[PDB]
Amino acid sequence: AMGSMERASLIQKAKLAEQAERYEDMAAFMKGAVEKGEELSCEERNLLSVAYKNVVGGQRAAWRVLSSIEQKSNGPEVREYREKVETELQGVCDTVLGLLDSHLIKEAGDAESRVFYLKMKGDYYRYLAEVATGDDKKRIIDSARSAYQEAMDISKKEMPPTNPIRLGLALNFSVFHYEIANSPEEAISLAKTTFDEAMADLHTLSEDSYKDSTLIMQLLRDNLTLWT
Amino acid sequence: AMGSMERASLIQKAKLAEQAERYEDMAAFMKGAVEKGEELSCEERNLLSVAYKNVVGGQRAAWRVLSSIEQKSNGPEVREYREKVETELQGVCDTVLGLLDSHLIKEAGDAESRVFYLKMKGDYYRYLAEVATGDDKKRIIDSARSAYQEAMDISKKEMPPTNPIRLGLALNFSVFHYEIANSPEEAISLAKTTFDEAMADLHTLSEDSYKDSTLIMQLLRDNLTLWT
Amino acid sequence: AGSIPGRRS
Amino acid sequence: AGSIPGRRS
Numbered sequence: 001a002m003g004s005m006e007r008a009s010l011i012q013k014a015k016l017a018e019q020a021e022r023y024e025d026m027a028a029f030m031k032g033a034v035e036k037g038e039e040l041s042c043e044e045r046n047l048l049s050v051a052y053k054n055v056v057g058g059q060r061a062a063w064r065v066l067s068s069i070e071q072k073s074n075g076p077e078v079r080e081y082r083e084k085v086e087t088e089l090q091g092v093c094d095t096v097l098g099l100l101d102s103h104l105i106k107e108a109g110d111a112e113s114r115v116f117y118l119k120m121k122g123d124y125y126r127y128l129a130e131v132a133t134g135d136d137k138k139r140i141i142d143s144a145r146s147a148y149q150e151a152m153d154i155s156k157k158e159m160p161p162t163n164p165i166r167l168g169l170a171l172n173f174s175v176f177h178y179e180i181a182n183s184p185e186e187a188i189s190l191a192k193t194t195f196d197e198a199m200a201d202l203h204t205l206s207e208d209s210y211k212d213s214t215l216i217m218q219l220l221r222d223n224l225t226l227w228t
Numbered sequence: 229a230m231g232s233m234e235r236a237s238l239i240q241k242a243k244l245a246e247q248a249e250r251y252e253d254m255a256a257f258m259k260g261a262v263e264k265g266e267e268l269s270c271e272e273r274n275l276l277s278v279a280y281k282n283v284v285g286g287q288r289a290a291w292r293v294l295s296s297i298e299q300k301s302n303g304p305e306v307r308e309y310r311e312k313v314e315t316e317l318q319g320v321c322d323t324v325l326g327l328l329d330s331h332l333i334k335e336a337g338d339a340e341s342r343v344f345y346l347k348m349k350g351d352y353y354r355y356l357a358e359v360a361t362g363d364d365k366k367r368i369i370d371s372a373r374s375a376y377q378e379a380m381d382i383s384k385k386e387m388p389p390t391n392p393i394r395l396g397l398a399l400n401f402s403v404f405h406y407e408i409a410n411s412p413e414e415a416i417s418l419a420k421t422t423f424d425e426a427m428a429d430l431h432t433l434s435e436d437s438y439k440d441s442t443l444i445m446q447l448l449r450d451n452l453t454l455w456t
Numbered sequence: 457a458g459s460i461p462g463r464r465s
Numbered sequence: 466a467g468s469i470p471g472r473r474s
């Protein structure tokens with residue numbers, strides 16, 4: 001529906017939609033921007049991520065409320081409505097994964113773009129895994145793991161240990177291990193090793209980069225406090 | 229789209245959507261329930277009101293953000309996007325007004341249902357007036373005033389001065405006077421008279437009704453503090 | 457000024 | 466546990 005609007009206008013309206021907290025609009029604008037076919041800048045990648053993170057975040061919150069009501073009940077209404085929200089969530093995840101596959105990832109050659117998209121791919125397979133129950137839950141989990149793992153491999157070779165994208169990737173991969181893969185020990189070990197190697201690299205950073213990295217290290221520490 | 233779902237299922241799903249904070253769903257479910265043609269109960273009227281109040285409330289918040297950015301700027305993007313949100317808001321208001329006109333109001337014979345719907349009619353014309361700028365802004369304002377006035381007339385004849393619907397009607401009509409009609413003195417006089425007559429009737433109420441009424445009287449007092 | 461919040465229950 | 470909040474900017 002965005003084929004007739006300029007790429008630059010879609011980006012400008014995505015920024016406006018974020019200010020207005022209209023995240024469904026924001027996501028549609030950035031989907032249109034991706035479909036122009038050009039690669040995305042650092043700023044533009046973050047707009048894409050923020051838009052869909054908010055959209056799927058509201059759907060995940062609603063799914064958990066409805067799933068909890070459904071488990072307490074065990075008419076068809078609660079199950080039917082949970083299924084509807086679940087189907088809508090899966091469609092959003094499939095849309096994001098389709099954008100990454102057509103063709104953001106294959107054209108991403110720099111470490112910072114490629115790791116960013118692969119982390120995204122792991123995240124949205126993780127969201128699919130949160131609601132998966134059938135014969136494909138194992139394959140969805142492995143799809144998330146494989147995307148995170150490739151991102152991890154690149155980030156360890158190409159980024160410093162304090163790089164915020166590398167830190168956020170490890171944070172979310174650790175959450176994957178703890179919440180999805182039933183591997184809490186792997187989750188704790190990744191979070192600790194990530195935190196400790198970042199701590200040793202902080203001396204290299206400017207005041208602004210120091211603030212960026214320590215913010216995410218605090219999230220790693222928050223999870224370790226909860227997990228140990 | 230709700231023609232094939234049972235009235236009772238629509239109501240139950242509206243309650244589920246409120247718990248999930250899915251207010252667009254909630255509004256669609258209650259629109260479907262209204263279109264079954266039966267009158268609405270007290271509880272059902274409040275579900276209808278809460279659903280659309282949340283939907284239009286997000287649109288009003290977004291419109292104000294975009295309108296403020298647009299005024300600061302004075303490309304076409306900000307104006308275009310504000311117009312889009314404005315058009316979407318007007319469609320929601322028109323939908324609510326259409327439900328009241330077909331046929332909630334004409335079948336509402338009790339004071340508590342009739343005042344409730346007429347207050348609703350005044351509110352959604354007020355929301356239309358907030359964004360109106362053309363040759364119909366005066367007619368929209370008069371439509372809001374006329375609906376509020378008929379509701380006021382019924383509530384004064386048929387309800388005690390502490391009735392929460394009567395109090396909330398007077399509160400919103402006072403906001404209409406202050407924010408829309410450029411009549412701050414009428415706004416202050418209505419709020420004061422409403423508060424004072426409710427205060428004198430509180431001695432008649434149970435503990436639970438006392439809490440209901442004093443909550444809304446506090447909102448009247450909050451506005452008077454801001455206006456004087 | 458505040459109208460009836462009207463967004464809960 | 467918290468993933469990257471990721472909802473602003």
Ligand SMILES: *Cc1ccc([N+](=O)[O-])c(OC(=O)c2ccc(C(F)(F)F)nc2C)c1
Binds near residue numbers: 393395461462
């Ligand atoms: C027009 C109107 C009149 C009265 C009231 N009221 O609060 O009584 C309302 O608003 C509501 O619909 C309402 C009622 C009660 C609560 C509660 F959370 F405090 F229980 N919230 C709301 C939003 C409108």
Ligand SMILES: *Cc1ccc([N+](=O)[O-])c(OC(=O)c2ccc(C(F)(F)F)nc2C)c1
Binds near residue numbers: 469474
């Ligand atoms: C995957 C990932 C890695 C790092 C970061 N990060 O915060 O640096 C994020 O999250 C964000 O997109 C982000 C960045 C900065 C802010 C700010 F408000 F603190 F400026 N917020 C967010 C949501 C993700």
Ligand SMILES: [Ca+2]
Binds near residue numbers: 007
């Ligand atoms: Ca172009």
Ligand SMILES: [Ca+2]
Binds near residue numbers: 234235
């Ligand atoms: Ca029936």
Ligand SMILES: [Cl-]
Binds near residue numbers: 241
């Ligand atoms: Cl449903």
Ligand SMILES: [Cl-]
Binds near residue numbers: 039109
């Ligand atoms: Cl490239």
Ligand SMILES: [Cl-]
Binds near residue numbers: 013308309312
């Ligand atoms: Cl637009």
Ligand SMILES: [Cl-]
Binds near residue numbers: 335337338
């Ligand atoms: Cl009737």
